[PDB]
Amino acid sequence: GPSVALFPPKPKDTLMISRTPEVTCVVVDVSHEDPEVKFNWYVDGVEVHNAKTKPREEQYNSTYRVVSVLTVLHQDWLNGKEYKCKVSNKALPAPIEKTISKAKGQPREPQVYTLPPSREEMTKNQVSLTCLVKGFYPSDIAVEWESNGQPENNYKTTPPVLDSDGSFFLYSKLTVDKSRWQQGNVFSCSVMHEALHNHYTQKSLSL
């Protein structure tokens, strides 16, 4: 029968007030016999009525996928409100409920440091600029490298790692042509996290 998956907003969308965070309720294996699907949404038990249900989407295996998207208030998500999707369908003996919310725990402010390439790496044609982000909680975070107000195309960020004090850390490594570093171009590591002032900080690094 029908099955439901409930997906959280992207951290960056919850952290930047200009962006639009969404909770997404997805129903799959909706049958042709009982194709109609009702979604009820609740926020800490109180029904809300602003969800947009997308049109049914027919799969290659003769079932439908039906999606309801609930726009959330950034502050509600960050204040730990519970989002419940209730999915009714005539093939279900009772409606399916799923609930989600933000990871729990006292927030802790990330410390953000940029580290230049080792002198030993300067023998190479590409070099590594390092962004250390440590002491944060919970693990929900976004970390991005930019130059001239635009994202860099060769960086990779480690997952959050539990540190010995129960906070998280990660590193993001930016690789650039050595000549760009030598020319004095400025590179910036932007970090978004709920325990930062304005949910944002940026640290820059140049030769």
Ligand X SMILES: *[C@@H]1O[C@H](CO[C@H]2O[C@@H](C)[C@@H](O)[C@@H](O)[C@@H]2O)[C@@H](O[C@@H]2O[C@H](CO)[C@@H](O[C@@H]3O[C@H](CO[C@H]4O[C@H](CO)[C@@H](O)[C@H](O)[C@@H]4O[C@@H]4O[C@H](CO)[C@@H](O)[C@H](O)[C@H]4NC(C)=O)[C@@H](O)[C@H](O[C@H]4O[C@H](CO)[C@@H](O)[C@H](O)[C@@H]4O)[C@@H]3O)[C@H](O)[C@H]2NC(C)=O)[C@H](O)[C@H]1NC(C)=O
SS3 180: helix
Q: Is 24 in the site for ligand X (CB under 6 A)?
A: yes
Find out whether 191 and 143 touch, Cβ atoms under 8 Å.
Answer: yes
Find out whether 188 and 7 touch, Cβ atoms under 8 Å.
Answer: no
* Residue of 33, 50, 55, 60 that binds ligand X (CB under 6 A): 60
Closest CA to 85 of 51, 54, 111: 51
Of 7-36, binders to Cl ion (CB under 5 A) are 16-18
CB of 106 to ligand X, least distance (A): 26
Q: Which does 16 bind (CB under 5 to 8 A by kind): Cl ion, ligand X, none?
A: Cl ion
Q: Which does 18 bind (CB under 5 to 8 A by kind): Cl ion, ligand X, none?
A: Cl ion
Find out whether 40 and 51 touch, Cβ atoms under 8 Å.
Answer: no
Write out the two tokens for 80: 């730990």
Find out whether 174 and 131 touch, Cβ atoms under 8 Å.
Answer: yes
Write out the two tokens for 204: 């820059």
CA distances from 158 to 42, 101, 125, 129, 185 (A): 35, 24, 23, 14, 24
Q: Which stretch binds ligand X (CB under 6 A): 47-55, 61-69, 129-137, 182-190?
A: 61-69
Q: Is 85 in the site for ligand X (CB under 6 A)?
A: no
Closest CA to 11 of 110, 155, 86: 110
Looking at beta carbons, which residue is closest to ligand X? 60
Find out whether 172 and 134 touch, Cβ atoms under 8 Å.
Answer: no
* Residue of 23, 26, 66, 176 that binds ligand X (CB under 6 A): 26
Q: Is 17 in the site for ligand X (CB under 6 A)?
A: no
Closer residue to ligand X in complex, CB, 96/115: 96
Q: Is 63 in the site for ligand X (CB under 6 A)?
A: yes
Q: Is 29 in the site for ligand X (CB under 6 A)?
A: yes
CB of 199 to Cl ion, least distance (A): 8
Closer residue to ligand X in complex, CB, 124/156: 156
Binding site for ligand X (CB under 6 A): 3-5, 7, 24, 26, 28-29, 59-61, 63, 65
